[PDB]
Structures are given as C-alpha cells and as structure tokens.
Design a protein around this ligand. Structure first.
Ligand SMILES: Nc1ncnc2c1ncn2[C@@H]1O[C@H](COP(=O)(O)OP(=O)(O)OP(=O)(O)O)[C@@H](O)[C@H]1O
Length: 229
C-alpha cells in the first residue's frame, strides 16, 4: 500500500526537513509494529504517509487491494466529538449489533460505560461530562477498529494505559480483529513485548530509516537485546 522513495517530511513550508532519506513501504495484508525511541520521527512518518505534510522531495504511490483510500487512523492525542458514546464510536457509519458487541468487548466498553451515568447515551468531551485518559484513549482505539478500513493506525494505545491488564486485553482484541476481518494495521508505540514475534517491524530512528524489513532482520541487527531483557 504505502510506497515512499525520496522520503522528505517538512513542517516548515520550505527547508529544514524533519524526516529525510526515509525509504520504507507498508504492503497490504500485514500487521506492522513500529519500534523506535522517543521523539525520533515516529508520528511524523505516519502523518507523511497520510499526506498531511509537505511532500517536497519524494514519491508517494498509494493503492489498496496513486489513489488514496479511506484509511483509518487515531493520533497519539485522541479526539472525542461532543456527542453520545455510540455516535462517538460508530462515527456516522451504519450500526450493527454483532460488530458493536465485539468491539465493545475487546475495547472494554461495558466496564467503561459503568463508570458513566448513561454510558452509550452520555455526553463526553468539552461542554460535557468529563472523562479520563484511559477512557478517551480506548474510545479512540475502538473508533479506529470499528470503521472497517483497508488499514488501521493505532498511535500508542498501549502507552496510554499503564495497567498490564488493559494492555493485554487490547493486544488480544487487536489480534482477534485482524485475524477475523483481514485488514491491515499499524501500531506506533513502544511495546516491544510482541513486535519481534509476528510483526514486520520498521525503524525510522534519529530522523531517518534504519531498516525496513520483516522479523527476520530482527536477528541480523543486534538491537533487540534490550527488548528481550
Ligand atoms: N505536528 C507537529 N508540528 C510541528 N512539529 C512537529 C509536529 N509533529 C512532529 N514535529 C516535530 O518532529 C519531531 C518528530 O516527533 P515524533 O514523530 O518522533 O514524535 P512522537 O514520538 O510521536 O511524540 P511524543 O513524545 O509526543 O510521543 C518532533 O520532535 C518535532 O520537532
């Protein structure tokens, strides 16, 4: 799907590229884990592949299985439309009882709605009943998974929740959704407990790509020693 050759990303409308020499691809039928340090150009790569940055020096050939499809996404900072929880998650799409139950189970929405006086009918966000960081992160994650897109981007949903139970439940739900729906995904986070197992990692470290390959290259780079310790 994703194809980048020149690899230029610039927030300034002229000069000073924040991400350069990035030559990576994200082929369809995949579940990509993203591994990298803090502030090394991780979310910038996701936005550049989305086409929300100045594409000055590089090529972007997009085609699903250069035309863009409705790619699902959820930024690191979440976003909760001031409406009901059902509308905040379905997001102007047809409502199905089967898939809503599956999503609300994997995303742990029944315990969450219990913390609310209405749940699937309460108001949330600005000018509404307040929320918590974990609840907002999980609500955003559910909306990305329920939208039935050719891809699904999860910008650090595991980092948001310190608890291991929520992280393990979310990881199991992501695996189940990807296996039972056959849709690509990409998790941009720092949770290395699963990335070298059955994911095709790609590292853009210190403002440039290090290696864009499969899990085989993880045994030929001498870098996962800290992830396994
Ligand atoms: N929206 C933006 N506007 C301006 N500069 C940006 C923006 N996003 C990223 N940058 C710049 O590009 C750099 C790359 O950041 P990067 O993508 O690694 O962030 P991150 O690891 O996702 O962030 P965080 O620490 O919040 O989790 C940033 O340090 C910043 O200098």
């Amino acid at each position: 799907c994703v194809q980048i050759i020149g690899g230029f990303f610039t927030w300034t409308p002229d000069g000073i590229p924040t991400l350069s020499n990035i030559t990576i691809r994200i082929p369809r039928g995949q579940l990509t884990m993203i591994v990298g340090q803090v502030g090394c150009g991780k979310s910038s790569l996701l936005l550049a592949t989305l086409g929300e940055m100045q594409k000055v020096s590089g090529a972007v050939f997009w085609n699903s299985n250069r035309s863009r499809g409705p790619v699902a996404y959820a930024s690191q900072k979440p976003w909760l439309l001031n409406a009901t929880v059902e509308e905040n998650i379905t997001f102007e799409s047809p409502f199905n009882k089967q898939r809503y139950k599956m999503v609300i189970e994997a995303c742990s929405l029944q315990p969450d709605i219990d913390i609310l006086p209405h749940g699937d009918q309460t108001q949330i966000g600005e000018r509404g009943i307040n929320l918590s960081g974990g609840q907002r992160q999980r609500i955003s994650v559910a909306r990305a998974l329920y939208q039935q897109t050719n891809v699904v981007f999860l910008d650090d949903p595991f980092s948001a929740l310190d608890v291991h139970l929520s992280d393990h439940l979310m990881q199991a739900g992501i695996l189940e959704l990807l296996r039972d729906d056959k849709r690509t995904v990409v998790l941009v986070t720092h949770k290395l407990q699963y990335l070298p197992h059955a994911d095709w990692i790609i590292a853009m470290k210190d403002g440039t790509i290090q290696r864009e390959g499969t899990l085989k290259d993880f045994q030929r780079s001498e870098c996962q020693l800290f992830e396994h310790w």
